[PDB]
Design an enzyme around this catalytic site. Structure first.
Site, PDB file in Angstrom:
ATOM      1  N   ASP A 132       7.214  -6.792 -39.376  1.00 20.08           N
ATOM      2  CA  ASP A 132       6.459  -7.938 -38.862  1.00 20.08           C
ATOM      3  C   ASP A 132       5.020  -7.583 -38.523  1.00 20.08           C
ATOM      4  O   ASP A 132       4.475  -8.061 -37.556  1.00 20.08           O
ATOM      5  CB  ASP A 132       7.164  -8.482 -37.618  1.00 20.08           C
ATOM      6  CG  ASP A 132       8.480  -9.168 -37.948  1.00 20.08           C
ATOM      7  OD1 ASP A 132       8.704  -9.468 -39.152  1.00 20.08           O
ATOM      8  OD2 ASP A 132       9.287  -9.435 -37.009  1.00 20.08           O
ATOM      9  N   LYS A 134       1.161  -7.406 -38.201  1.00 17.21           N
ATOM     10  CA  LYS A 134       0.121  -8.410 -38.208  1.00 17.21           C
ATOM     11  C   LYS A 134      -0.908  -8.127 -37.103  1.00 17.21           C
ATOM     12  O   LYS A 134      -0.671  -7.272 -36.282  1.00 17.21           O
ATOM     13  CB  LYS A 134       0.745  -9.791 -38.062  1.00 17.21           C
ATOM     14  CG  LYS A 134       1.451 -10.070 -36.750  1.00 17.21           C
ATOM     15  CD  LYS A 134       2.041 -11.464 -36.787  1.00 17.21           C
ATOM     16  CE  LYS A 134       2.965 -11.717 -35.618  1.00 17.21           C
ATOM     17  NZ  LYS A 134       4.273 -11.045 -35.850  1.00 17.21           N
ATOM     18  N   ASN A 137      -0.195  -7.526 -33.347  1.00 15.11           N
ATOM     19  CA  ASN A 137       0.505  -6.292 -33.045  1.00 15.11           C
ATOM     20  C   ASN A 137      -0.419  -5.069 -33.040  1.00 15.11           C
ATOM     21  O   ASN A 137       0.035  -3.936 -32.989  1.00 15.11           O
ATOM     22  CB  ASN A 137       1.618  -6.068 -34.057  1.00 15.11           C
ATOM     23  CG  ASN A 137       2.753  -7.064 -33.920  1.00 15.11           C
ATOM     24  OD1 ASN A 137       3.205  -7.394 -32.822  1.00 15.11           O
ATOM     25  ND2 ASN A 137       3.239  -7.526 -35.044  1.00 15.11           N
ATOM     26  N   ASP A 153       5.602  -2.928 -31.129  1.00 14.77           N
ATOM     27  CA  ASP A 153       6.803  -3.611 -31.682  1.00 14.77           C
ATOM     28  C   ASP A 153       7.415  -2.950 -32.906  1.00 14.77           C
ATOM     29  O   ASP A 153       8.262  -3.549 -33.575  1.00 14.77           O
ATOM     30  CB  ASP A 153       6.567  -5.118 -31.953  1.00 14.77           C
ATOM     31  CG  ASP A 153       6.292  -5.948 -30.656  1.00 14.77           C
ATOM     32  OD1 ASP A 153       6.697  -5.554 -29.538  1.00 14.77           O
ATOM     33  OD2 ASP A 153       5.688  -7.053 -30.774  1.00 14.77           O
ATOM     34  N   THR A 172       2.655 -15.728 -38.890  1.00 15.88           N
ATOM     35  CA  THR A 172       3.450 -14.663 -39.520  1.00 15.88           C
ATOM     36  C   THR A 172       3.438 -14.758 -41.017  1.00 15.88           C
ATOM     37  O   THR A 172       3.491 -13.716 -41.712  1.00 15.88           O
ATOM     38  CB  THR A 172       4.929 -14.671 -39.074  1.00 15.88           C
ATOM     39  OG1 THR A 172       5.517 -15.950 -39.322  1.00 15.88           O
ATOM     40  CG2 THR A 172       5.037 -14.341 -37.577  1.00 15.88           C
TER      41      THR A 172
HETATM   42  C1  LIG Z   1      10.473  -1.176 -28.523  1.00 17.08           C
HETATM   43  C2  LIG Z   1       9.333  -2.117 -28.163  1.00 17.08           C
HETATM   44  O1  LIG Z   1       9.057  -1.968 -26.753  1.00 17.08           O
HETATM   45  C3  LIG Z   1       8.044  -2.710 -26.219  1.00 17.08           C
HETATM   46  C4  LIG Z   1       7.806  -2.502 -24.876  1.00 17.08           C
HETATM   47  C5  LIG Z   1       6.686  -3.001 -24.295  1.00 17.08           C
HETATM   48  C6  LIG Z   1       5.756  -3.741 -25.046  1.00 17.08           C
HETATM   49  C7  LIG Z   1       4.528  -4.207 -24.536  1.00 17.08           C
HETATM   50  C8  LIG Z   1       3.658  -4.891 -25.343  1.00 17.08           C
HETATM   51  C9  LIG Z   1       2.390  -5.437 -24.834  1.00 17.08           C
HETATM   52  N1  LIG Z   1       2.119  -6.706 -25.112  1.00 17.08           N
HETATM   53  N2  LIG Z   1       0.908  -6.965 -24.521  1.00 17.08           N
HETATM   54  C10 LIG Z   1       0.347  -8.351 -24.703  1.00 17.08           C
HETATM   55  C11 LIG Z   1      -1.013  -8.252 -25.402  1.00 17.08           C
HETATM   56  C12 LIG Z   1       1.300  -9.174 -25.569  1.00 17.08           C
HETATM   57  C13 LIG Z   1       0.208  -9.021 -23.337  1.00 17.08           C
HETATM   58  C14 LIG Z   1       0.425  -5.888 -23.873  1.00 17.08           C
HETATM   59  N3  LIG Z   1      -0.681  -5.896 -23.107  1.00 17.08           N
HETATM   60  C15 LIG Z   1       1.351  -4.838 -24.070  1.00 17.08           C
HETATM   61  C16 LIG Z   1       1.097  -3.472 -23.585  1.00 17.08           C
HETATM   62  N4  LIG Z   1       1.749  -2.453 -24.111  1.00 17.08           N
HETATM   63  O2  LIG Z   1       0.264  -3.281 -22.711  1.00 17.08           O
HETATM   64  C17 LIG Z   1       4.067  -5.130 -26.644  1.00 17.08           C
HETATM   65  N5  LIG Z   1       5.211  -4.756 -27.173  1.00 17.08           N
HETATM   66  C18 LIG Z   1       6.060  -4.038 -26.386  1.00 17.08           C
HETATM   67  C19 LIG Z   1       7.238  -3.523 -26.968  1.00 17.08           C
END
Ligand SMILES: CCOc1ccc2cc(-c3nn(C(C)(C)C)c(N)c3C(N)=O)cnc2c1
Length: 465
Positions: A132, A134, A137, A153, A172
């Protein structure tokens, strides 16, 4: 001796909404370490795999380390939720940063894609496919100008069924690899997606586009794209050659992430000294600013519609919960009951992920009571508590709708043309006859433009009000 997420972390605030769930900024109650916690609701997202398989994945992802990949720390599961604890990144989405530069070139694009390919190559070596991939991400590590890109992700798509709700799949279609649609896919789908991202970084438009999602998927599935636009005149054969190799139909013939890293274009334009011919790509940056604004406005539109529907669901439910606990028949209750009731809204709804414990509820109630001109500790009229409480939830999404609207209105006209709405509702996948029918009824004298009040009325009408 089973480990529980809220014994260890307390929620600080909400960072935003990603694929599969809410992201909350959390803090360890003993060490003070800050972390971004993805909260996936078991009621909204179905698993594709068994328990065994997912834990094995989580264990592996916790051991992996790369400068271009989000770092995972912990994993909790309780009855209604999975909690994915990761390192917090404060630099925002790539494209949001990129629209804020006034200059962007093939050296900058190439530095970005080297980072991305380098995280991908690494993950493919450990047999992990994104699927996924993009622009949303790709976060930047910090608000620094020189900030590294972290891919979020990795790993989720193999274990969780993607949302069908359009509020979750906006944007997407542009990125997905033909073979992912047909169901036989491998790691090369990540190269396709990256190839698309590079096409957009160099031109500002998607290679496969259309008036709505299924139109977009039909182009992708045909796999035909062209470099025929004026702004491709500004770009090296070399970059076009890499794109061609990444957007190759049959995956077996498509270049690997690792061989993409050794491609001439990457080699040439990521050497830090030589800028042998480095024009700024202003058309590209202009198209990207437009494409980005369109997406974020459709996104906020749908989240506003969703929030309004959620609100009606929760107002009527909270009212009924209280009406019941009020044995008196008068309409009067006290702080400790309002709390028991709000909590029981949570036990049934389980939609609000910043209410991760009993203490998150207590404090929300106090924020409500401190809002209304009411002693937080005599006996309060439930009717008015319900009003203030729900609006407070619609704040985040109504204020963001207004903001995505202002940000879309780049010339500060106050209004959006009928042609612009067409593109906005195309991306949100609201039928054309349906939104014209709603427009017609809001301003029955209009001349193909709406202001913010009008636009907002259209959305309220499109969710049944
Ligand atoms: C196995 C995947 O585990 C995670 C755990 C925490 C996650 C945090 C984020 C994250 N998202 N955001 C937004 C921009 C959507 C508010 C952040 N600021 C994240 C971060 N790591 O600081 C993204 N995917 C994650 C995926």
């Amino acid at each position: 001796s089973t480990a529980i997420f809220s014994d260890r972390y307390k929620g600080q605030r909400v960072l935003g909404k990603g694929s599969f769930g809410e992201v909350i900024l959390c803090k360890d109650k003993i060490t003070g370490q800050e972390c971004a916690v993805k909260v996936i609701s078991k009621r909204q997202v179905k698993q594709k795999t068994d328990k065994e398989s997912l834990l094995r994945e989580v264990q592996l992802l916790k051991q992996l380390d790369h400068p271009n990949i989000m770092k995972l720390y912990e994993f909790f599961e309780d009855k209604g939720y999975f909690y994915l604890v990761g390192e917090v990144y404060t630099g925002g989405e790539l494209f949001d940063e990129i629209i804020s530069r006034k200059r962007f070139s093939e050296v900058d694009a190439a530095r970005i894609i080297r980072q991305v390919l380098s995280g991908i190559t690494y993950m493919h070596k450990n047999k992990i496919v994104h699927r996924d991939l993009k622009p949303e991400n790709l976060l930047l590590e910090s608000k620094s100008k020189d900030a590294n890109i972290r891919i979020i992700d990795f790993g989720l798509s193999t274990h969780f069924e993607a949302s069908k709700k359009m509020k979750d799949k906006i944007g997407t279609a542009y990125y997905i690899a033909p073979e992912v649609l047909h169901g036989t896919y491998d790691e090369k789908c990540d190269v396709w997606s990256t190839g698309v991202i590079l096409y957009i970084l160099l031109s500002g438009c998607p290679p496969f586009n259309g008036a709505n999602e299924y139109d977009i998927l039909k182009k992708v599935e045909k796999g035909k794209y062209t470099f025929e636009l004026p702004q491709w005149k500004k770009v090296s054969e070399s970059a076009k050659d890499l794109i061609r190799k990444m957007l190759t139909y049959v995956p077996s013939m498509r270049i690997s992430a690792r061989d993409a890293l050794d491609h001439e274009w990457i080699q040439t334009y990521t050497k830090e000294q030589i800028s042998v011919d480095v024009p700024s790509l202003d058309n590209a940056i202009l198209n990207i600013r437009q494409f980005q604004g369109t997406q974020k406005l459709a996104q906020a539109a749908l989240l506003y519609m969703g929030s309004k529907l959620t609100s009606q669901d929760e107002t009527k439910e909270l009212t009924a919960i209280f009406h019941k606990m009020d044995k008196n028949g008068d309409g009067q209750l006290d702080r400790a009951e309002l709390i028991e009731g709000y909590k029981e809204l949570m036990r049934m709804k389980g939609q609000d992920a910043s209410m991760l414990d009993a203490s998150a509820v207590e404090h929300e109630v106090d924020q409500v009571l401190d809002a209304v001109d009411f002693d937080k500790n005599g006996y309060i009229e439930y009717s008015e508590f319900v009003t203030v409480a729900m609006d407070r939830k619609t704040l985040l999404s109504r204020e963001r709708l207004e903001r995505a609207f202002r940000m879309f209105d780049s010339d500060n006209s106050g209004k959006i043309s009928s042609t612009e709405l067409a593109t906005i509702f195309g991306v949100s996948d609201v039928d054309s006859e349906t939104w014209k029918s709603v427009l017609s009824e809001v301003d029955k004298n209009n001349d193909g433009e709406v202001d913010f009040d009008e636009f907002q009325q259209m959305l309220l009408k499109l969710c049944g009000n």
